Design a protein around this ligand. Structure first.
Ligand code: SWA
Ligand code: CA
Length: 736
């Protein structure tokens, strides 16, 4: 039963700086793999390491890059060639075409047209097997590139082996950071050379220099295959060698099979039927993208116990560690998805977070590998609390709570996105002022508020002191401090307490991050009713939502000076100011449920799923962002979305398929039957849950886990009476 056939790793690779259609590369990897491998079309150092329209491949690279914007670390490449032994990354490059390329999560193949060589790779979590099919030539070589900024290489002929380490990175690493790699060939070298800053040196065994490389070679018969076993570690050569054992004695075929099995095992936890081939492809591609980040950053020791290099303090320590995710993106639904279908995995991740705190002093917000300065918010709180509240509990709860509290009153000395920048003002005034030299104050305030709700939630659960509990309950209401009654919008506010003037609701950035007031105003995940109230009741609230879609996509970019890609992405979709291409607004359509008009959510949700996602190389409508934008589709296609992580609630949308089945780790299954689904029939007329009638606009975690059947009768006309009753509404803090 194979779902991998639907996965297109090229989806999102046809992106450019001006317009993102995903900004992804073909991550050939195991789920959450420590090391990813990709064909490399971009020049060394370029965030866009693989682009669909590129003509040439210049290497097969080990990568850890989460985003072109964030860039890479622990990176080196290998490239087979023929003819002259050349190290230069342009001269070694080869034309190829996509019709001569086969990309799957577990297997990658391509024909290098200028060398007449076929390259195949199959990876494990930490290692990979390459098989090079050479033409007949007296001069066949393999180039190993350690990249620049200080690297090391060494050839061991008596073991047909090349070892080295690479260090080029993009920040967020300890001074001693290194990636140690080992490469074993099954064919003896007739030619060997190391490379030292572009210089080829035959028979010099070893280089320690800015940019080390190696070239080995031999005579090849037509069709002769040479295999290279490769692995790496962030710990040591000894450890890299241990990692190499993941390959066993397997060949390309056997490893591919194991990787396929591995992926089907996770993709198969969600079976969908009764859709068209585009939908299958969009859906599983998205699911695959949701099982990559954060990556494992731990390695197995002699006793099979997890240990890790600390990207926070550079020691090697026992226990789990993961990295390469930005919580500002992924708290929204990516991690919620893990808690629903892959809690065993998130348990490891959560334990990793505890270690991050122990080793770093803070919980991370953006980590690649270590703390990096990107985005805003203290959403690690949502990640941590949502997990706990959903049954994924770390062993050290004392430490968890302390960590949470620590982050409310500290900001990292060098990485301002770690901890709460502006906490002094926030704690004192109730908001982060628009005029105190802290940017994106309004976005910070709104998210901090939701964060504090999460802390309140956990604190209550821990039966902490009333004074504590009350303090966060109070701070959860801070979003009110930025609400402008006249505009009905969230708005920047001065320290002196006056709202900021001139006010441009359509201006991006400044008070907000990559969105304007019309996008950020909806960021009250824990208290939609509270928001509804400030706007003057649900009717006015719905009017307000509706105009998001109804107005042209006009904008003010003065804060950026140029039409950044996320603005352009909005303009072209012709859906008003609904910028689905970016994270802040992604939950918004579901808010219709809270105002007693679920049918409007049903209508627009189906719009988005039909129009904003296609299965091709230009498949997404904005940055994919480490699973967030993909998992949005995954949830939404199933029919529900975790608007407010930290509750046990998935707010109801509309299911895309005629049947979906979930297999939870607990052994139960849940079937969602929508036999009458169609392109036309995207309204929910009625719903029953194991035979009971279900008029609510949400489902509960514990209920889903019990399994059974949900029936959804789809219709082509909205049902104006379902889900308008007050007990149908999802959670709002104000109602508590
Ligand atoms: O997604 C936000 C953030 C990502 O978290 C990391 C890449 C750069 N940024 C783009 C923003 O939209
Ligand atoms: Ca983004």
């Amino acid at each position: 039963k194979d779902w991998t056939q639907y996965v297109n790793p090229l989806m999102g690779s046809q992106s450019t700086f001006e317009l993102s259609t995903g900004n992804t590369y073909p991550a050939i990897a195991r789920p959450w793999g420590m090391n990813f491998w990709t064909p490399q079309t971009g020049k060394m150092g370029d965030g866009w390491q693989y682009t669909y329209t590129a003509n040439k491949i210049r290497g097969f690279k080990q990568t850890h890059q989460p985003s072109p914007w964030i860039n890479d670390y622990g990176q080196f490449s290998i490239m087979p060639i023929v003819g002259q032994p050349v190290f230069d990354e342009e001269k070694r490059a080869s034309w190829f075409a996509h019709k001569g390329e086969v990309a799957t999560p577990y297997y990658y193949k391509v024909y290098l047209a200028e060398h007449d060589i076929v390259t195949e790779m199959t990876p494990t979590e930490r290692a990979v097997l390459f098989r090079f099919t050479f033409p007949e030539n007296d001069h066949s070589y393999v180039v190993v590139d350690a990249f620049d900024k200080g690297s090391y290489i060494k050839i061991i002929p008596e073991e047909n082996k090349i070892i080295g380490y690479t260090t080029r990175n993009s920040g967020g690493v300890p001074e001693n950071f290194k990636n140690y790699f080992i490469i074993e060939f099954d064919k003896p070298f007739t030619y060997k050379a190391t490379v030292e800053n572009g210089n080829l040196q035959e028979n010099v065994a070893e280089q320690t220099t800015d940019h080390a490389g190696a070239i080995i070679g031999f005579k090849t018969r037509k069709g002769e295959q040479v295999n290279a076993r490769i692995a790496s570690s962030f710990i040591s050569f000894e450890q890299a060698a241990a990692n190499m054992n993941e390959l066993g004695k397997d060949n390309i075929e056997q490893l591919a099979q194991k990787g396929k099995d591995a992926w089907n095992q996770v993709l198969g936890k969600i079976e969908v039927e009764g859709g068209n081939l585009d939908q299958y492809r969009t859906f599983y591609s998205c699911l695959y993208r949701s099982l990559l980040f954060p990556r494992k950053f731990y390695e197995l020791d002699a006793n099979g116990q997890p240990i890790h290099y600390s990207p926070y303090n550079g020691q090697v320590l026992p226990g789990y560690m993961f990295t390469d995710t930005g919580f500002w993106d992924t708290f929204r639904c990516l991690f919620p998805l893990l808690n629903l279908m892959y809690p065993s995995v998130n348990k490891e991740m959560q334990e990793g977070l505890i270690n991050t705190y122990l080793e770093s002093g803070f919980f991370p917000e953006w980590a690649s590998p270590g703390h990096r300065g990107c985005m805003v918010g203290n959403n690690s709180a949502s990640i941590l609390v949502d997990a706990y509240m959903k049954g994924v509990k770390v062993d050290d709860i004392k430490t968890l709570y302390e960590g949470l509290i620590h982050g409310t009153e500290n900001v990292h000395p060098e990485v301002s996105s770690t901890g709460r920048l502006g906490y002094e003002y926030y704690n004192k005034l109730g908001y982060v002022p628009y005029d105190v030299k802290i940017n994106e104050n309004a976005a910070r305030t709104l998210e901090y508020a939701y964060d504090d709700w999460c802390i309140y939630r956990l604190a209550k659960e821990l039966k902490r002191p009333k004074k504590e509990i009350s303090l966060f309950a109070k701070r959860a209401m801070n979003y009110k401090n930025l609400f402008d009654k006249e505009s009905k919008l969230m708005r920047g506010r001065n320290e002196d307490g006056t709202f900021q003037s001139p006010f441009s609701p359509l201006k991006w950035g400044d008070a907000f991050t990559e969105g304007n007031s019309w996008h950020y105003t909806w960021s009250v995940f824990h208290d939609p009713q509270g928001l509804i109230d400030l706007m003057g009741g649900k009717e006015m609230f719905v009017t307000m939502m509706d105009s998001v879609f109804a107005v042209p996509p006009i904008f003010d970019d003065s804060y950026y000076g140029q039409v950044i890609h996320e603005i352009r992405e909005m303009t072209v979709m012709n859906m008003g100011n609904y910028a689905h291409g970016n994270q802040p607004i992604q939950h918004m359509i579901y808010l219709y449920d809270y105002a007693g008009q679920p049918w409007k959510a049903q209508y627009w949700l189906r719009q988005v799923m039909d129009r904003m996602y296609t299965p091709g190389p230009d498949g997404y409508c904005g940055d994919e962002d480490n699973g967030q934008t993909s998992a949005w589709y995954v949830f939404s296609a199933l029919g529900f979305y975790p608007v407010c992580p930290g509750t046990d609630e998935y707010v109801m949308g509309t299911p895309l398929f005629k049947k979906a089945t979930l297999h939870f780790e607990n052994g139960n299954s849940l079937v969602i039957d929508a036999p009458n689904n169609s392109t036309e029939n995207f309204y929910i007329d009625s719903m029953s849950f194991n035979g009971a009638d279900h008029t609510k606009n949400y489902l509960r975690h514990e209920d889903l886990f019990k399994g059974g059947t949900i029936k959804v009768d789809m219709s082509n006309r909205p049902n104006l009476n379902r889900g308008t009753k007050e007990e149908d509404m999802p959670y709002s803090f104000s109602k508590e």
